Amino acid sequence: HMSICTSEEWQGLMQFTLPVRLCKEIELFHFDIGPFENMWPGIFVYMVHRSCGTSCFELEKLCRFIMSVKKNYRRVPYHNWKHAVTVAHCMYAILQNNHTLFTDLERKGLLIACLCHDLDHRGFSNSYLQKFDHPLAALYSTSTMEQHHFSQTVSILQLEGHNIFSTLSSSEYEQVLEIIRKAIIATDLALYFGNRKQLEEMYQTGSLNLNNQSHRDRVIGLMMTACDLCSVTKLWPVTKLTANDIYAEFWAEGDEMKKLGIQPIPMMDRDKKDEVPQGQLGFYNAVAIPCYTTLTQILPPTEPLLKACRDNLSQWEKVIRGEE
Numbered sequence: 001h002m003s004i005c006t007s008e009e010w011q012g013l014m015q016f017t018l019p020v021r022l023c024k025e026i027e028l029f030h031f032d033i034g035p036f037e038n039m040w041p042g043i044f045v046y047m048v049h050r051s052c053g054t055s056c057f058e059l060e061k062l063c064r065f066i067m068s069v070k071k072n073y074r075r076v077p078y079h080n081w082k083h084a085v086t087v088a089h090c091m092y093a094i095l096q097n098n099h100t101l102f103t104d105l106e107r108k109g110l111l112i113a114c115l116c117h118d119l120d121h122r123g124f125s126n127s128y129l130q131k132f133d134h135p136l137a138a139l140y141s142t143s144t145m146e147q148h149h150f151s152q153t154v155s156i157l158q159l160e161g162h163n164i165f166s167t168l169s170s171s172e173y174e175q176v177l178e179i180i181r182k183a184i185i186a187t188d189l190a191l192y193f194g195n196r197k198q199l200e201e202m203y204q205t206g207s208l209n210l211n212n213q214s215h216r217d218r219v220i221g222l223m224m225t226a227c228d229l230c231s232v233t234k235l236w237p238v239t240k241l242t243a244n245d246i247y248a249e250f251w252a253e254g255d256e257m258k259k260l261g262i263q264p265i266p267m268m269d270r271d272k273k274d275e276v277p278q279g280q281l282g283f284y285n286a287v288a289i290p291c292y293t294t295l296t297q298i299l300p301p302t303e304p305l306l307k308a309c310r311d312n313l314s315q316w317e318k319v320i321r322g323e324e
């Protein structure tokens with residue numbers, strides 16, 4: 001049932017040399033991949049090599065993997081390849097900026113997870129599939145997409161000469177699949193709330209054991225979430241336009257409800273175009289900010305996110321107050 005790259009593709013990738021003027025930008029957290037799509041797969045390669053060295057993965061096997069992923073990403077408005085790479089740029093950006101803090105076995109699993117975390121998004125929400133009534137919410141009951149996202153990671157690696165992690169002990173290979181599993185689950189934004197709760201507390205008290213493997217996992221979780229929402233931390237006009245990407249998908253899904261004579265929540269309702277900056281603001285305030293705060297908290301390097309998170313918020317304010 002899976003989908004796979006061709007010789008042409010992965011050898012085309014294998015060939016890629018990133019242009020020197022980009023080595024500078026890509027290191028900034030606010031960096032936006034949008035203009036340079038051609039390079040998108042190439043870029044992820046660059047970042048693996050910068051993080052994990054050109055000797056962490058068999059290059060043939062890697063490019064093969066990157067592109068087959070690329071194929072299991074649907075041509076949807078927002079939950080698409082462009083997204084996976086944007087997110088995975090952010091996890092990188094993070095990991096570089098906290099270099100001593102994560103194992104080799106960690107940077108890998110994550111940078112990978114970040115690429116895979118929405119594999120085969122059909123553009124609808126968990127709520128959409130659960131509350132009626134896909135063969136996906138018939139088999140995965142909770143975090144539907146998020147486990148599919150992973151079982152879709154799972155299968156990909158199980159494809160011919162794709163298994164990038166063949167160079168590890170069944171104990172490390174199993175370890176990293178379990179690093180991924182968790183890390184990809186983390187992206188169920190619902191889960192972030194109980195997750196960030198703890199992380200506020202264990203900071204408040206200050207009983208947060210970086211040695212404790214279950215504590216540990218949680219920081220990742222927020223990390224994921226942080227990267228997942230990162231579109232908010234790009235410069236105003238990048239964020240501006242990405243908002244229409246989420247809105248296309250949202251309303252598209254609300255239109256599907258409407259076609260059964262069901263009122264979709266005003267978020268997915270396109271006939272409420274105007275309430276958006278109002279909504280967006282709430283989200284920044286209730287969700288984004290508390291998120292990037294607790295982060296900058298645990299990982300002070302991550303400050304520029306929160307800095308730029310605010311700058312956008314500020315702008316949405318303006319747009320409401322009548323100044324855009």
Ligand SMILES: Cn1cc(-c2ccc(=O)n(C)c2)c(COc2ccc(-c3ccc4ccccc4n3)cc2)n1
Nearest residue numbers: 189228229230231232266267272275276279280283
């Ligand atoms: C799980 N999740 C990740 C993201 C997200 C959000 C923004 C963003 O830039 N990214 C990258 C990701 C979201 C919803 O974000 C939104 C949050 C809220 C609205 C909203 C809410 C209420 C509205 C009411 C009326 C009109 C428009 C309204 N609009 C839109 C998007 N849910």
Ligand SMILES: [Mg+2]
Nearest residue numbers: 117118187188
């Ligand atoms: Mg997701």
Ligand SMILES: [Zn+2]
Nearest residue numbers: 117118187228
């Ligand atoms: Zn996502």
